[PDB]
Amino acid sequence: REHWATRLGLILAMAGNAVGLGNFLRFPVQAAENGGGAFMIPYIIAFLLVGIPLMWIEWAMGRYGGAQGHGTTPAIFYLLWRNRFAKILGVFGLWIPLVVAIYYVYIESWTLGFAIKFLVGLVPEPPTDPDSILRPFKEFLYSYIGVPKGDEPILKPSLFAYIVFLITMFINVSILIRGISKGIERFAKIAMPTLFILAVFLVIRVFLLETPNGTAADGLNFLWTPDFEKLKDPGVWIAAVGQIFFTLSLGFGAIITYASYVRKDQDIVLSGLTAATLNEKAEVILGGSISIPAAVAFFGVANAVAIAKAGAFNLGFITLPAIFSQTAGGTFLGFLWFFLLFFAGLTSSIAIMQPMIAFLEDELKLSRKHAVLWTAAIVFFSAHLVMFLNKSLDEMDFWAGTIGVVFFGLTELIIFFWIFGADKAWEEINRGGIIKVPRIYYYVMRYITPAFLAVLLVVWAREYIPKIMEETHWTVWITRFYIIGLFLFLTFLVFLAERRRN
Ligand SMILES: C[N+](C)(C)CCOP(=O)(O)O
Ligand SMILES: CC(C)C[C@H](N)C(=O)O
Ligand code: NA
Ligand code: NA
């Protein structure tokens, strides 16, 4: 089995897995919609009672399966629990990262195309009216991804966007095809430091933004000022947990797969804690200090919150660049922004394709080259659905990146810490650890976490079950049908692997 070359490389690889579009796009929006500081408390709690324990659990399962030559859940679940249904459940550790990868890589290609156009300097040129400043950039984005005028089911992506998507796929492939140590680790050691530097620079530049309408400092205060009136709002807790899952790459089967390449004897405790911590630093300190403080700086708090509620891509791809365009060297600043986004995105995407690749290698005994090329083929092909179908992206992000990750986190935790046994699991986690997990967490993993997740899922289901059946748009039914198809496909591949074993 292939292994990480150095501990540093491992850390930066995992951190590259975690740190991504979720930090600089999803987070600012989530925190803004949820009332700034009010969102932080639950967030932190969700980080302590969910993110950390599940992170350690996934590292442990990953290394455990890796020792035996298995980096994916279909096999690992079976090692931990002997059942066919364990394999069937294991299918989600493929389906989820694949589905998420499909749209994620596309958004990444967006960040790339924008990076290029802003570098070369082809951008809308604004003239004191907010709508006259934002409108050009809204039209810019809409022309890029081909957004319809009314609400219409069909998207018309520009040729440039498509070509850039091809290029992005090519970069992902060029990285993944060199393997764990050579392809992924090498790139991590560069992309990560680059990312941190760019992020710091942007944070500082943004912090200097002050106008008659407000300041970046106002945004920082808004984000860091506690509000206890929202603590009774379940939605805030749900959003916090969802964000924790998404940003730490939990429930995507990615962490597990990366961990399967960690040598049996190497420490997963301090490495894991370090990766998670790095992610949170990149999220709250970096991600939260860029978009929001700038928006608040120019338009004030209320307007910034309104913009955040407007959409996830509205703050990142429209508002921010429009704000930069009003400053000296704003185009170049926009470029830096989109380049940062692109590197974070890439470092995540490779991580979410790796599970499929690793299944093809381990279970079907395919060579790395073939596994990578076929994974790329599948992702690229499926991506046309997200490209040409309006609202498809949201559907995938919902079923896979929202519900699926929580369900799968609960499932993996239940299999590892309950069925496989709690003491054996604990010992497996602490084994080889440079430092040891605080005893209290044993009780957090076994009782608190699973209960919390179960409650969450119950609430969610309660709310969504009625809504699902009545939904008007056909695009979503097409998407659902297709991803169900993907699930059947993966299940079939698992069947084939199982048969090959015998
Ligand atoms: C009954 N079941 C389908 C849930 C489990 C069967 O697993 P197995 O005994 O065939 O391995
Ligand atoms: C799906 C995951 C790889 C996403 C990543 N953790 C992020 O924060 O963007
Ligand atoms: Na993240
Ligand atoms: Na990343």
b/e per residue 417-441 (b: at least 16 CB within 10 A): beebebeebbebbbbebeeebeeeb
Main-chain dihedrals φ then ψ at residue 377, nearest 5 degrees: -60, -50
Helix and strand numbers, DSSP H then E, in the chain: 26, 2
Domain count along the chain:
1
The ligand that comes nearest to the alpha carbon of residue 98 is 2
Q: Is 84 annotated as a binding residue?
A: yes
498 Cα: distance to centroid of ligand 2 (angstroms): 30
Q: Which residues surround ligand 3, an ion (CB under 5 A)?
A: 18-19, 22-23, 247, 279
Give the C-alpha separation, 268 to 239, whole Å: 28
CA nearest ligand 1 atom 11, residue: 83
Ligand 2 atom with least separation from CA of 97: 1
User: What are the backbone angles phi and psi of residue 211, rounded to the nearest 5°?
Assistant: -135, 175
Looking at ligand 1, which residue's alpha carbon is closest to its atom 4?
85
The DSSP element (H or E) to which 210 belongs, if any, is strand 210-211
Q: Helix, strand, or coil here: 215? A: strand
Residue keyed to tokens 């470029």: 335
Nearest to 31 by CA among 40, 22, 21: 40
Experimental determination technique: X-ray
Q: Write out residues with Cβ below 6 Å of ligand 2.
A: 18, 20-23, 100, 246-247, 249, 252, 254, 348, 351-352
- Which of 54, 248, 249 is the pocket-test mutation for ligand 2 (most atoms within 8 Å of CB)? 249
| Cβ count within 10 A of residue 481 | 9
Which range marks the domain in which residue 272 is found? 1-502
Instruction: Give, in degrees to the nearest 5, the angle at Cα 123 between 122 and 127.
Output: 130
Per DSSP, 154 falls in state B
Alpha-carbon 489 to chain mean position: 24
What amino acid occupies position 218? D
Ligand nearest to the CA of 88: 1
